[PDB]
Amino acid sequence: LVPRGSHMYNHNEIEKKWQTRWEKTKAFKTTNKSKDKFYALDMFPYPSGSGLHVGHPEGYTATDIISRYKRLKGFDVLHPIGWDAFGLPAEQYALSSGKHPQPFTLKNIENFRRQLKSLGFSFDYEKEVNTTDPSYYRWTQWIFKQIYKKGLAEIREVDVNWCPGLGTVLANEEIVENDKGEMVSERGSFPVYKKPMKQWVLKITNYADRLLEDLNLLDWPDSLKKLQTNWIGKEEIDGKITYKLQDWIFARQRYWGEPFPVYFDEDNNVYLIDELVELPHMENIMPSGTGEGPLATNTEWVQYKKNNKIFKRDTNTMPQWAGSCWYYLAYIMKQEDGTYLPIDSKKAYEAFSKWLPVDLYIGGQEHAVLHLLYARFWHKILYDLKIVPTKEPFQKLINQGMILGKDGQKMSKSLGNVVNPDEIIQNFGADTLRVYEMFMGPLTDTKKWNESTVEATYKWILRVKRIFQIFIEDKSKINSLHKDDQFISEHNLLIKEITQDIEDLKFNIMISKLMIFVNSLYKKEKIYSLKPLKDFAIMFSTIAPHISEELLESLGEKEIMFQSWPTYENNKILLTKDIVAIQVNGKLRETFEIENDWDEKRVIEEAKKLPNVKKILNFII
Numbered sequence: 114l115v116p117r118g119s120h121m122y123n124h125n126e127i128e129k130k131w132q133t134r135w136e137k138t139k140a141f142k143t144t145n146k147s148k149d150k151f152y153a154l155d156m157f158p159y160p161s162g163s164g165l166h167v168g169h170p171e172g173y174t175a176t177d178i179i180s181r182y183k184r185l186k187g188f189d190v191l192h193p194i195g196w197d198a199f200g201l202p203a204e205q206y207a208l209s210s211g212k213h214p215q216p217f218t219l220k221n222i223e224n225f226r227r228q229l230k231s232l233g234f235s236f237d238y239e240k241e242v243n244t245t246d247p248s249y250y251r252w253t254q255w256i257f258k259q260i261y262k263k264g265l266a267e268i269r270e271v272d273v274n275w276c277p278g279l280g281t282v283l284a285n286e287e288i289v290e291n292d293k294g295e296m297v298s299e300r301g302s303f304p305v306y307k308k309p310m311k312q313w314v315l316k317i318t319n320y321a322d323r324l325l326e327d328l329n330l331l332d333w334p335d336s337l338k339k340l341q342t343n344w345i346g347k348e349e350i351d352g353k354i355t356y357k358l359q360d361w362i363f364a365r366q367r368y369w370g371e372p373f374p375v376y377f378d379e380d381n382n383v384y385l386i387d388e389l390v391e392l393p394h395m396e397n398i399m400p401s402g403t404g405e406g407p408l409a410t411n412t413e414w415v416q417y418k419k420n421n422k423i424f425k426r427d428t429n430t431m432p433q434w435a436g437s438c439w440y441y442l443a444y445i446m447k448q449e450d451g452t453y454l455p456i457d458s459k460k461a462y463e464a465f466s467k468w469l470p471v472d473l474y475i476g477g478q479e480h481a482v483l484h485l486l487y488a489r490f491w492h493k494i495l496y497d498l499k500i501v502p503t504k505e506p507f508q509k510l511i512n513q514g515m516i517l518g519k520d521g522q523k524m525s526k527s528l529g530n531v532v533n534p535d536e537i538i539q540n541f542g543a544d545t546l547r548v549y550e551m552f553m554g555p556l557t558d559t560k561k562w563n564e565s566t567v568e569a570t571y572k573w574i575l576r577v578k579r580i581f582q583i584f585i586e587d588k589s590k591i592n593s594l595h596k597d598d599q600f601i602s603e604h605n606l607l608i609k610e611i612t613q614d615i616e617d618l619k620f621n622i623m624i625s626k627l628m629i630f631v632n633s634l635y636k637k638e639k640i641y642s643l644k645p646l647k648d649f650a651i652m653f654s655t656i657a658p659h660i661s662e663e664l665l666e667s668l669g670e671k672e673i674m675f676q677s678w679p680t681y682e683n684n685k686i687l688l689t690k691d692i693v694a695i696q697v698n699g700k701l702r703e704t705f706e707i708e709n710d711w712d713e714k715r716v717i718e719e720a721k722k723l724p725n726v727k728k729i730l731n732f733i734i
């Protein structure tokens with residue numbers, strides 16, 4: 114049932130209005146007016162279909178809520194989007210559509226961008242990166258070269274996973290075992306087998322001990338630390354320190370990827386090219402199954418002329434992972450005029466020191482031993498080279514649970530179980546989509562799409578809009594003399610508890626709390642002030658920004674970009690609890706509330722949580 118008549122509000126019109134206003138007013142531009150910084154990052158998407166499905170926005174909603182909250186708390190916020198556009202995902206969608214990946218990728222990116230704007234994510238579109246732009250992959254190639262010069266890239270004979278169906282080698286991390294114990298590509302489920310071949314490898318095993326140990330520095334889920342620990346698989350066996358991890362098969366026999374900025378002489382000595390080496394435009398881009406890539410047939414390009422000698426260019430390309438290994442840095446390098454600060458410049462390093470590590474990164478568990486391992490590896494090499502200031506790229510990682518289709522499988526184009534976001538956004542609105550996805554369950558749980566809960570979410574938003582109408586359009590329903598201490602208390606507590614839920618990324622519970630508050634407004638003949646509506650709107654804006662802006666405007670208030678997070682007075686909350694003063698050797702370092710009297714020895718590990726560490730809690734040596 115699509116909302117109409119008395120069961121609808123003007124969601125399409127409101128959402129377009131506010132999207133337009135945010136663009137004109139530059140609402141999401143990354144500011145630099147504070148010493149408080151927050152880098153909230155989504156895993157950027159592949160343009161490997163005609164558009165997003167409703168699964169994609171789930172994690173993007175979660176980081177948007179935090180980003181929006183942080184702006185309201187006065188932080189400068191980096192929250193950017195971009196296109197993971199090289200390598201197999203983009204190429205395979207082009208090939209399977211009978212299109213050339215250059216124009217087709219551009220065309221699909223336009224659609225993705227339109228979809229994202231229609232959802233009201235607070236991206237600064239001036240920070241966009243595209244891993245296929247030559248100004249971007251200039252740096253991908255630079256990084257590879259520095260990896261080489263450090264001794265960490267070489268061509269050697271290894272046992273590769275040959276994939277006849279793709280015409281290429283694949284890395285061990287790109288292979289999975291099926292129900293019958295057979296090895297297939299993680300993407301496409303193409304059969305593979307082992308074969309000795311001379312191929313480019315990156316020496317990830319040389320970083321294995323640090324990749325393992327440095328997990329201790331990270332606020333990452335146990336499940337993810339475990340996957341990486343087991344993949345690295347460090348074991349002493351008969352005195353040899355061994356690893357299940359092998360060096361990273363890095364070259365692909367495909368057209369659509371970064372060229373290796375490399376040429377060879379008659380003895381196969383490797384030489385490096387200093388400048389950007391662009392992928393030549395070719396029409397003959399189908400993979401040959403021979404062990405060489407399609408670039409090998411481009412005779413004129415492969416013949417590298419230097420000092421009257423004819424050398425041979427490398428004819429492989431880099432994998433899709435090369436651009437995603439450093440894109441979190443590219444966003445910091447990206448400039449208003451469309452250029453990138455040089456990665457090794459002083460200005461880059463200072464900007465990195467301001468923004469890194471990413472404070473909150475959300476993306477799927479499927480990247481456990483792919484991007485989330487590989488990116489850590491490149492980052493550490495850059496750290497060793499004094500290019501980046503931190504040991505680790507991403508401090509806090511959350512893996513959003515998969516949204517499943519109605520078949521109960523993970524939602525994906527490949528399984529033909531997708532729901533098109535354009536239809537939900539048309540029929541119900543972006544605000545409903547965002548609220549619904551957070552309400553489906555805990556962010557980290559998997560969950561199944563359910564039409565009737567979508568419809569219930571829309572009815573709820575309609576209910577919010579109608580309660581605002583009641584109290585705003587009739588001035589007699591607001592009277593500062595009205596006596597209802599419990600409500601003034603409920604209001605102050607809402608601010609406190611919603612704040613805590615946002616901080617905890619417990620967005621489903623946050624919505625339940627907003628629903629309870631609305632139930633309470635519907636019982637009130639009068640309320641003391643419009644302030645609780647203003648505060649509700651400001652806070653709801655983090656999840657339902659379009660309708661929240663509309664409600665704020667109808668209150669005669671300023672737009673969200675000029676607002677602050679609501680403050681509460683704890684002396685209006687009708688129930689107080691014990692405050693425990695924590696000390697470091699007789700000297701006060703923190704105080705905090707302990708809710709109830711449940712535990713005592715378990716609750717001394719709650720005093721360790723607070724960033725500055727029943728009555729007193731002294732810590733003597």
Ligand SMILES: CC(C)C[C@H](N)C(=O)NS(=O)(=O)OC[C@H]1O[C@@H](n2cnc3c(N)ncnc32)[C@H](O)[C@@H]1O
Nearest residue numbers: 156157158159168169197437476477484515516524
């Ligand atoms: C950093 C780089 C290596 C990322 C890479 N370019 C990439 O993965 N691109 S992407 O388009 O496939 O995915 C984008 C995001 O969307 C999530 N997602 C996908 N399906 C679902 C689903 N059914 N439910 C919830 N989330 C989903 C997915 O995990 C990821 O974080």
